[PDB]
Amino acid sequence: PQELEAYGISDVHDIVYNPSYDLLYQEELDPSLTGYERGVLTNLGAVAVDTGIFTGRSPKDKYIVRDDTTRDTFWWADKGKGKNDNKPLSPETWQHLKGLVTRQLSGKRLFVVDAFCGANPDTRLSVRFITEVAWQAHFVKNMFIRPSDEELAGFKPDFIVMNGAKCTNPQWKEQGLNSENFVAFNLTERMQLIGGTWYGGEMKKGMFSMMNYLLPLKGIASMHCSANVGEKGDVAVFFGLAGTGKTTLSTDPKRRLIGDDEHGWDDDGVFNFEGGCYAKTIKLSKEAEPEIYNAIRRDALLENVTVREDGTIDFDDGSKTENTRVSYPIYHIDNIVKPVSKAGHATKVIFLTADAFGVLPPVSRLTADQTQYHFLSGFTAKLAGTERGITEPTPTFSACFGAAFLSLHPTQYAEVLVKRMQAAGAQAYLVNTGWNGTGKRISIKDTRAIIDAILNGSLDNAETFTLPMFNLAIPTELPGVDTKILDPRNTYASPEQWQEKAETLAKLFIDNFDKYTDTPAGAALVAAGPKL
């Protein structure tokens, strides 16, 4: 307990260190629990919980302490270098938030989970997570790397994550913060503090943000991508924003899964940060996604799904949130890289996007300059009007396909990615997992056959022609793929109807890209973007 007292947490009478899966099951199903701690047992064998008022991350509540360690290296929200959520925090307000959390956890029954972030000993974080909520401990047991008993014996944390979801900050107005909630990081004390939000993804993406700070400064790419590997050792990575297909499409029975969301790329190859996968379950189809569906069993942890009185799950019900999720340890997938989630250098780099404007082609091979342009652009889009019965799509441009998690400037991630790709001779591709002129999403079946064709070389050998405006090389046909869909003009009444939309989208790309054109490298990439 005095070790806990070193963190500021007093008088803990009941300490649960390294809780087993069986204990976490017992704790969640305790009929005496109240409120959002409670779990419910589903007919699939997995416990389901509700994560409370927050059912996704709260970027507006994300703060990073600005001090002499971070001042000149962080990509700060206020430093005129493009928009981001790295809002500066004073060390004095940090101490206030730390007092809130440590007092909240003092005198409680605490779960302590030691885990690694990063598959390689030379660059991993040794993270100690502290929570008073059993399903939060379970989330981190699933999603981080579980140490061996030997690693546990000599465990030396170099980052502490203290989850005080049950406390809030009443001084937030005087302190200039956004709300009574907070997700704060301190790189001098090497700690994350959480208040107000119970959502487990803050811890997952928080540690991801810290890897995104430390690794590129050591020459190692740090990537919002999934990754898998063929029997020959050929590695693919799949970038993309939330919901664009990284987890869906890397979970592929023809490939060994490396990881689904967070990877590094060092001198030896591509390596997972995590010990689990965090899948979306909205409208989950057992036929369309059988491996992910099969992972939903005891020790998986369902979030915010609708569970019927009889224990069945209504996966289509988005009432609590569209962001229904399940975490599971990665070995709930049958065909994975083991015992360590890593492989060689990627030779296929796939940018996933869900184009709600219905303009981009299902697949295209990128030039080198197009790769850089679209990596910095980081496009996807949403049908935001759907619940009001309207389409109009809303663009998101998020640098590196994950600006919410970037702690350095986008160009620093671009430069090390390009360096790794060039050394490996990797080829890049752009895949629209989103919409076309039918006003419907491309089927998962068609997208998987597109991925197959990328990975087995058939797309590279295909005859291609250039789609106008975006100047994207697209194939005339592909094995097992519906041929009509390959040219996005074919799903509209006429190519001119596609063109009206392509022009709308091109202007959005051009306007977004302008902020990168204040270096000569950036200005020169304009020629690789869409052209009116």
Ligand X SMILES: Nc1ncnc2c1ncn2[C@@H]1O[C@H](COP(=O)(O)OP(=O)(O)OP(=O)(O)O)[C@@H](O)[C@H]1O
Q: What are the residues binding ligand X (CB under 6 A)?
A: 240, 242-249, 261, 278-280, 282, 433, 441-444, 447
User: Which 200-219 residues touch Mn ion, going by CB under 5 A?
Assistant: none
Strand partners, 467: 472
Starting at the edge strand that comes first in sequence, how are the strands of the sheet with 269-272 ordered? 221-223, 263-266, 269-272, 342-343
Q: How far is the CB of 450 from ligand X (least distance, A)?
A: 9
Taking the CA atoms of residue 400, residue 401, residue 402 and residue 404 in that order, the dihedral angle to the nearest 10 degrees is 100
Nearer to ligand X, 268 or 316 (CB): 316
Q: How far is the CB of 446 from ligand X (least distance, A)?
A: 7
Q: How far is the CB of 260 from Mn ion (least distance, A)?
A: 5
What would the two tokens of residue 488 be?
């996005």
510 binds, among Mn ion, ligand X, none (CB under 5 to 8 A by kind): none
Does the protein bind Mn ion through residue 132 (CB under 5 A)? Answer: no
433 binds, among Mn ion, ligand X, none (CB under 5 to 8 A by kind): ligand X
105 binds, among Mn ion, ligand X, none (CB under 5 to 8 A by kind): none
Q: Which residue is nearest to Mn ion (CB)?
A: 247
324 binds, among Mn ion, ligand X, none (CB under 5 to 8 A by kind): none
Closest CA to 248 of 403, 383, 352: 352
> What is the rounded CA–CA span in Å between residue 21 and residue 292?
20
User: Which 228-267 residues touch Mn ion, going by CB under 5 A?
Assistant: 246-247, 261
> What is the rounded CA–CA span in Å between residue 213 and residue 215?
6
Nearer to ligand X, 166 or 205 (CB): 205
Q: How far is the CB of 298 from ligand X (least distance, A)?
A: 22
Nearer to Mn ion, 246 or 256 (CB): 246
Contact between 97 and 176 under an 8 Å Cβ cutoff? The reply is no
Nearer to ligand X, 55 or 433 (CB): 433
Q: How far is the CB of 73 from ligand X (least distance, A)?
A: 25
Nearer to Mn ion, 261 or 274 (CB): 261
DSSP readout, 331-379?
GGSSSB--SSSEES-EEEEEEEE--TTS-S-SEEEPPHHHHHHHHHH-E
| Size of the residue set binding Mn ion (CB under 5 A) | 3
Nearer to Mn ion, 167 or 337 (CB): 337
Q: How far is the CB of 106 from ligand X (least distance, A)?
A: 34
Q: How far is the CB of 293 from Mn ion (least distance, A)?
A: 15
Contact between 79 and 70 under an 8 Å Cβ cutoff? The reply is no
Nearer to ligand X, 394 or 519 (CB): 394
Contact between 361 and 488 under an 8 Å Cβ cutoff? The reply is yes
> What is the rounded CA–CA span in Å between residue 19 and residue 39?
16
Contact between 207 and 159 under an 8 Å Cβ cutoff? The reply is yes
Closest CA to 353 of 174, 508, 142, 179: 508
* Interface contacts to Mn ion, rule CB under 5 A: 246-247, 261
